Each structure stands twice: as structure tokens, then as C-alpha cells.
Write a protein that holds these residues in place. Structure first.
Motif, short mmCIF file in Angstrom:
data_model
loop_
_atom_site.label_atom_id
_atom_site.label_comp_id
_atom_site.label_asym_id
_atom_site.label_seq_id
_atom_site.Cartn_x
_atom_site.Cartn_y
_atom_site.Cartn_z
N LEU B 55 0.82 -1.21 0.00
CA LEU B 55 0.00 0.00 0.00
C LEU B 55 0.86 1.26 0.00
CD1 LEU B 55 -2.20 -1.30 2.93
CD2 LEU B 55 -3.20 -1.02 0.65
N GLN B 56 1.97 1.22 0.74
CA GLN B 56 2.87 2.37 0.94
C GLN B 56 3.46 2.90 -0.37
OE1 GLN B 56 6.87 2.15 2.78
NE2 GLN B 56 6.04 3.24 4.55
N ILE B 57 4.11 2.02 -1.13
CA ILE B 57 4.73 2.37 -2.43
C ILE B 57 3.66 2.84 -3.43
CG2 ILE B 57 6.31 1.62 -4.27
CD1 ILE B 57 7.04 -0.74 -2.16
N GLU B 58 2.50 2.19 -3.40
CA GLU B 58 1.36 2.53 -4.26
C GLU B 58 0.75 3.91 -3.93
OE1 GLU B 58 -2.11 -0.26 -4.45
OE2 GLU B 58 -1.35 -0.67 -6.47
N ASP B 59 0.82 4.30 -2.65
CA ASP B 59 0.36 5.61 -2.19
C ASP B 59 1.25 6.76 -2.68
OD1 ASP B 59 -2.09 5.04 -0.81
OD2 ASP B 59 -0.96 4.33 0.92
N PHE B 60 2.57 6.57 -2.57
CA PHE B 60 3.55 7.56 -3.02
C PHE B 60 3.68 7.63 -4.54
CE2 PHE B 60 4.98 7.05 1.42
CZ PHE B 60 5.13 8.38 1.79
N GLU B 61 3.29 6.55 -5.22
CA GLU B 61 3.26 6.47 -6.69
C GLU B 61 2.23 7.43 -7.30
OE1 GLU B 61 5.58 4.08 -8.16
OE2 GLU B 61 5.21 5.32 -9.94
N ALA B 62 1.15 7.68 -6.56
CA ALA B 62 0.09 8.61 -6.95
C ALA B 62 0.58 10.06 -7.08
CB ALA B 62 -1.07 8.53 -5.97
N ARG B 63 1.53 10.45 -6.23
CA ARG B 63 2.15 11.78 -6.28
C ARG B 63 3.05 11.95 -7.51
NH1 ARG B 63 6.14 15.50 -5.39
NH2 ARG B 63 5.71 17.15 -3.87
#
Lengths: 56, 69
Positions: B55-63
Motif C-alpha cells: 500500500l505504501q509504495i502505491e500511495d507515493f506512486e500517486a504523487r
């Protein structure tokens, strides 16, 4: 459709350049180097005869 | 006839009997469950944190994906 593509993990920083546009390398903010490098000479001192003090 | 208070003992109520005894816990067996719960505790918790990384890497990927922002 061919629109679907998964990210999977991470981008890992991708590098791509084609258009470039004026290249652009040097701009920053500074205009001058200001007085340049200070003058420094190297020759190695021999011995220097006589001390500056009164007692020698 | 004379009627007075009669004597009765029957069981004698048991003169001084110990009731306190070791129950459930033995000693070494409690440590096997005690430290055993700890080892089960960390293994279950850290697997969730590895799932959090998904979830973490996928959250920062949005930015990174959002540049018109």
C-alpha cells in the motif's frame, strides 16, 4: 482495450529525452564569478634569512 | 424425664485442612505459552507491515503520477 497497464511495483526513475528544447544547461541565477580565484603562488620557501624579532 | 442439649459431632468438620494448592500453572509450562505468544505475536504483526508496504509504495506512486497537480 490496449489502455490497461499495471504499475506493479515502482517507477524507479525513468530517463527519457527527445524534444530537449534549447538544451538548457547554464542559467541558474548568478551573473558573475566575482573577482575570480585569489592569487596564490607556489615555489617552496628555502630558509628565510633572519627573524623579524629583535633577538636573532 | 430430663431433656437437655444433646451432643453431636458426626464428621468433626475436619480439624485444620489445607485448601491452598497449585492449580493451572506449573512453572516451566507457563513460559512455553508466555514466550510462545510473543514469538507468535511478532510473526503475525510483521507480515501485516509487509502488506502495508504494498500500500505504501502505491500511495507515493500517486504523487509521482500526478504532474498536472
Amino acid at each position: 482495450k490496449x489502455x490497461x497497464x499495471x504499475x506493479x511495483x515502482x517507477x524507479x526513475x525513468x530517463x527519457x529525452x527527445x524534444x530537449x528544447x534549447x538544451x538548457x544547461x547554464x542559467x541558474x541565477x548568478x551573473x558573475x564569478x566575482x573577482x575570480x580565484x585569489x592569487x596564490x603562488x607556489x615555489x617552496x620557501x628555502x630558509x628565510x634569512x633572519x627573524x623579524x624579532x629583535x633577538x636573532x | 424425664x430430663x431433656x437437655x442439649x444433646x451432643x453431636x459431632x458426626x464428621x468433626x468438620x475436619x480439624x485444620x485442612x489445607x485448601x491452598x494448592x497449585x492449580x493451572x500453572x506449573x512453572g516451566y509450562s507457563m513460559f512455553a505459552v508466555g514466550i510462545g505468544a510473543l514469538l507468535f505475536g511478532y510473526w503475525s504483526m510483521m507480515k501485516w507491515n509487509r502488506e502495508r508496504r504494498r500500500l505504501q509504495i502505491e500511495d507515493f506512486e500517486a504523487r509521482i503520477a500526478l504532474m498536472p497537480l
